[PDB]
């Protein structure tokens, strides 16, 4: 018998005395060591005193798991640990003062999301995500990346979309203050305002231009005609404008950052463009700069606080 610490959150630790003859599994159920599944493994001497994640198997641990992760999904832990087993081997170089990810395991979308998250104002509701976000920002992003995979229901190597990933993370964030008022104007039906809150207040799919959204865009009306959707009022610290990739000109100082996407649906490559004193293009570990940019953009992020249109 050695003694170990079991946990679900790596905050509340529980002392166990484990049989050196019995597997971890026989004694605790599914058991992980820094991401690596050790259910079917017996305890080695150098395991003495270390901390293992266990699957919750009593009320105390289920409550601590919900309080840390904001999920009761029993697969969540195993998916988090399977992802961490890879993300702990990725490299996280600082590029232009941001934690990036050196390319591995089709991670371009995760690196682009990670870089974006360091440039917009967001508070995560699950303490697991908030703690890992602070650690990632200071250069240790392995846990954060594994949690992004677990929360998005994605595995390492799976092809991912930055807009879809940001959408899932925003659903785990405090965006309640965020408010969007839209006006739709049709010839026949007339004018209808609607108010959106939370995630739907900060995301739009259909144009990259925040300015064009303010001037209005042409959308189908239930009557059958085209109509004009325009932005009446925005209350959020940022907005995310997305569209199917298309050649687009990015101007220094007119946006926060953007997702570049090159190639076919699903199996292309993301890079990240950020507006500093000049335009930086972050491609995992690679960095280029230029004063101008035109290329295939699918997401553009902008700063906001309070906007009210000058349209009656
Ligand atoms: C829901 C299923 C799904 O697999 N989604 C998903 C997963 C992973 C990726 C990389 C993408 C994706 O290719 N995203 C880019 C940005 C994209 C977005 C929209 C329209 C597009 C049209 C042409 C080309 C790219 C287009 C989508
Ligand atoms: Cl715990
Ligand atoms: Cl929740
Ligand atoms: Cl949540
Ligand atoms: Zn406990
Ligand atoms: Zn929650
Ligand atoms: Zn891997
Ligand atoms: Zn109508």
UniProtKB/Swiss-Prot annotation:
Domain Ubiquitin-like as annotated: residue spans: 1-54
Catalyzed reactions: Thiol-dependent hydrolysis of ester, thioester, amide, peptide and isopeptide bonds formed by the C-terminal Gly of ubiquitin (a 76-residue protein attached to proteins as an intracellular targeting signal)
Regulation: Inhibited in vitro by GRL-0617.
Domain Peptidase C16, residue spans: 68-312
Record note on what altering residue 229 to Q does: In strain: Gamma/P.1
C4-type Zn finger ranges: 186-223
Listed result of changing residue 265 to G/T: Reduced inhibition by GRL-0617
Binding site for Zn(2+) 4: 186, 189, 221, 223
Record note on what altering residue 142 to D does: In strain: Alpha/B.1.1.7
Residues annotated as the enzyme's active site: 108, 269, 283
Mode of membrane association: Multi-pass membrane protein
Assembly with partners or alone: May form homohexamers. Interacts with N protein.
Name of protein: Papain-like protease nsp3
Whole-protein coverage range: 1567 to 1878 of 4405
